[PDB]
Structure formats: structure tokens, C-alpha cells
Amino acid sequence: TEFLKPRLVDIEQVSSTHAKVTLEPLERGFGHTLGNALRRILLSSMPGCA
Amino acid sequence: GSVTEFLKPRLVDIEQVSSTHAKVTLEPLERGFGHTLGNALRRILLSSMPGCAVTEVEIDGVLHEYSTKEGVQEDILEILLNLKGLAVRVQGKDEVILTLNKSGIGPVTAADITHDGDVEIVKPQHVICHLTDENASISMRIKVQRGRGYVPASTRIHSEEDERPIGRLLVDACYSPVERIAYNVEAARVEQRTDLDKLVIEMETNGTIDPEEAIRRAATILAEQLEAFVDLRDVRQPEVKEEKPEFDPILLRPVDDLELTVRSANCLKAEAIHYIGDLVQRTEVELLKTPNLGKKSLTEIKDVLASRGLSLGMRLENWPPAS
Amino acid sequence: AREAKVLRMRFGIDMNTDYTLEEVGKQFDVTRERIRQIEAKALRKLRHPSRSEVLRS
Amino acid sequence: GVLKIVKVYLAVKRRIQPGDKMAGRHGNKGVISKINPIEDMPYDENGTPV
Amino acid sequence: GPEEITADIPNVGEAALSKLDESGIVYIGAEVTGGDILVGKVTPKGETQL
Which positions does the site annotation Interaction with anti-sigma factors cover (chain C)? Predict the structure, then answer.
């Protein structure tokens, strides 16, 4: 009728800077959609001072 | 919380070129977002969309989909394929049965379908059949449901209708109402600043859905999916399923597995006896007071129970553990 | 014991030669019907376990 | 031999499963890999995918 | 002994008559899958000892 939600969530911090996040329950293309979206947001749409 | 600037996108003119082709323009957009929302909206529209489609079709005089009918220039398969691309718009239901009766010489279109007050047909000119002789007549029942993302008949092996008559012919479903989706960035001449873009979304559908609810549902799906990207508790699953059956697993099966007469089945269905777990612990005293249950039915029960090893009117006050 | 041996000896298992109601009724004093009674009661015991149930098929 | 025999003609319909040997007309051999949704396939200025 | 085509197949459930007729032959147009019965047939064999 609608859709499902991602339930299994894992996060491993290989330090304070490097990290890995995994989300298992996802439908077709959603992994890539959120992937590219978040990638395009994190690589420019982020504030920060320089 | 007090940071960032950012802007907000809004819907403008929805140029409806045709009943199938449309254009949705989003003007209030920057450069990064205007080109980022493109792929997101495109993918969600080219898949994650509702819509209605035909699932089952029952035709009179036809058993399987590999047969034919007298006076029909097209075989059954072709008719099913013609029902595959049937533009249907159901008002407020999830399953509708459209009856289609038509006789005499001439082509049978979607207009010959009995017009329902809930079903809205986009193209009543859709070719379905071609009756030849004037003595030929066809009467079929079409089932339309509301789903998402293909899902053919091969997926459902037999997980629907335990009996399902021979007349019912299963057809593949093309739920996604959207045919093609394109989008162009383009520099926006927004009478304000200077560095803004207007995400123009070129859309082509079947006419069974309007751009309004289409774009809003798509963005709704994107938002609901981004909702899990807020907090990250890393919730795990408890698992640890119990592996110790206290009683025989057969008692978990319904009375339909007993394979008995129709009368006895109706008596058990009227005596509130669904599973065999209740019949196995029901004495003959209570079975005698059951409406329309004589010696034949009682002997039927004891024979179909003793054969499976079980007895009648036992006691196991552990029902039902333990979910 | 007076039921395990009964079912075991009657249907003849783990002892090769199987005996009848008489040859077991004589070795257990009470003859025929009595030894059949217990033989039936043992069958009553096996109406809950699922091991032999699924082993049937 | 002996007695009666029974023949059963049943029809199945197979789709293009990942692994089917499909080729062109110029000795263009090939084996289908994956399935790949339409939502993530190469497109142009128009909606037309591939 | 000879082998007969019947619907009285030993060790069967309700799935027997589900696809098969009163004789033991599947109806024309029925949907069958890997495991289903098409023609009911039994062969004589005593002894077995058990």
C-alpha cells in the first residue's frame, strides 16, 4: 500500500573523522537515490568555515 | 538552533500539453538543489508510484489462456495483452470488478465496458477484441487492483485463493502509471537575485494520474525515507526465537486439513471450531448438541481424527501458547 | 517396564522373533486381554509427541 | 508393453532470467547479467531510457 | 499384478482432488507446479516385511 522503513542500522567509527554507516532495509533505487542525494549535499551544501 | 540560510522550492505552472504528457516546473531553486532533486524525483516517479492495473480475468467458455473462441479474430493471449494496457482510474477502492458484455459484428473497445460510477476510463477507444460474425458474443469479468512496481503472476504461485476456479486467468500487472521522466536544470530568470535555477520536469504518463498528487507523493516518499536519517540509535533485532514445541504441531492446523464432508465442515464452522485444537478436546457430548450433526457426521469426525493418530475429546489445557 | 517390554515384545522389536498375546500373557501371568489392554494403553500415550508423527509421512 | 498410457501437454512461459544466452546477428554472443530497473538506466535529454 | 490409473493414491491429502478429477487425471486448464500430481497411478507390491 505504501512502503517500509529501514530497521537494521550499524555505525562503526574508525576514529573521530572516518566512519561507516549501513542501512539494510531499503527498496530498489532508494539506496542510490539517497546515496547520490546525500553525496551532493555533503560535498557542497554543507556550511563550515574555511 | 540558529544556523544556515537556504531557500525553498515551490510549484509554478503545470503545462498540460495532453492527457498523457505534462510539464511540472519548480522555479524557486538554487544551483545545487535544483540539479540534485532531479534524479531523486525522477527515480521515485519512474517506479515508486501507485496506479491501477488488471490482475485477473474470467471469460465464459474459455478455460486456459492458450485457447480461442468462435467469432474472435484475436486469440485469448492477445486479449489479455490488450487488457494489460487498460487505463483505469478507481475512485476510492483497492479492487473493482468490471463486467464486459458485447455481441455482434464490430471491434470491442473499452467503451463497451459497463460504465461504473467509481471507475474512470481514460481511453474508451482502447482496442480489446474484434468480433467477426454477428452471432458471436463475449462476456468477461475483469479485476482491477491498486498496487506498485510491476509484480507479475509468477510472483504469486498460489498465495491467493486456495481454490481459485479454472476460469480465472492470471495476467501480469504494470502498476507504474508513469511512462517516461526527464528534467532540465536551466538558468531561472527569477525577478529577484541572479544565481537561481528552475528545475523543469518533463513528464509523460498514461493519463491515469495527475502531476499534482504524483509530485507530492514522490516528495512525500523521499521525506519519509529521509526521516530515518535524523536519529541513529542503531536499533538491533532481539531475535532469539523459542525452539521448543510443547504440543504436536498438527494441532496448529485448521479443520480444513481433516478432509471431511461439507455438512460436518459447516457444523464445525458454526460451532466456532476453526482449528483442530478445539475439536480434539471436544467430547461427543457437546458434538451431539450441535445443529445438523447426526450419527454419520459424528462417525465422520472420529474416523478422520483417529486416522491421523489423534483422538476425540482429549484434554491439553495449554491453548494457545505463547506469542 | 510392564509396558515397554509389552509393546516391544508384541510387535517384535530389538529381539528378532516376535511373540503373540499368548506367549507374552504366559510370561506375564495375566493372559490375553490384559496384555492387550496395556498394549492399547501404550498406544494412548503416543498421541502428543511429534517425533514418530512426522516420521510417519 | 501393456495397458493404457496417458500424455499430458502442459504449457509454461519463461521470462528472460539472468543467464540466458542471447546474441545478435553478427556473431554477437552474450549472456544476460542482473536485471537492472528502468529507474537507474542511461537516459538522454528526453525521458527515453535504454 | 497390473498397474491401474486411479485417484485413490495412498499417503495423499486434499491436494489430490484439488487438481485431479474423480478418475485421477488433471483438469484441462489447471495450474500446476513442481510437486503436483498429473496422473494418479499405483503399482501393486506386497511382502515388504516391514
Answer: 10
In 3D space, the residue among B307, B300, B263 whose CA is nearest the CA of residue B284 turns out to be B300
Residues of chain B with CATH 1.10.150.20: 261-323
Listed in order, the ranges of chain B carrying CATH 2.170.120.12 are: 51-175
Q: Which chains touch B (3 or more CB pairs under 8 A)?
A: A, C, D, E
As separate numbers, helices (DSSP H) first and strands (DSSP E) second, chain D gives 0, 0
Contact A37 B33 (CB under 8 A): no
Which 3 state secondary structure label does DSSP give B4?
Answer: coil
Resolution given for this structure, in angstroms:
3.9
Could you name the CATH architecture of B261-323? Orthogonal Bundle (1.10)
Taking only Cα atoms into account, the Rg of chain D, rounded to an integer number of angstroms, comes to 21
Give the determination technique: X-ray
CB spacing of B256 vs E27 below 8 angstroms? no
Whole-angstrom distance, CA of residue C27 vs CA of residue C21: 10
And the C-alpha cell for B298? 459424528
Interface test with B, best of E12, E31, E32 (most B CBs within 10 A): E31
Q: Which residues from chain B sit within 8 angstroms of residue E13, using beta carbons?
A: 257, 259
Interface test with E, best of B166, B253, B258 (most E CBs within 10 A): B166
In the CATH scheme, what is the homologous superfamily, with its name and number, of domain B1-50+176-229? RNA polymerase, RBP11-like subunit (3.30.1360.10)
**Prior bond to B320 cis, omega within 30?**
yes
Long-range (24+ apart) CB contacts under 8 A made by B210-216 are B211/B14, B211/B16, B211/B22, B211/B24, B212/B14, B214/B45, B214/B49, B214/B177, B214/B178, B215/B11, B215/B24, B215/B41, B215/B45
Distance CA B218, CA B148 (A): 13
Q: What is the DSSP letter of E4?
A: B
Residue of C nearest to B316 (CA): C48
Strand-pairing partners, residue E13, are none
Domains of chain C: 1-57 (1.10.10.10)
Q: Give the B window 207-266 contacts with C, CB below 8 Å.
A: 245, 247-250
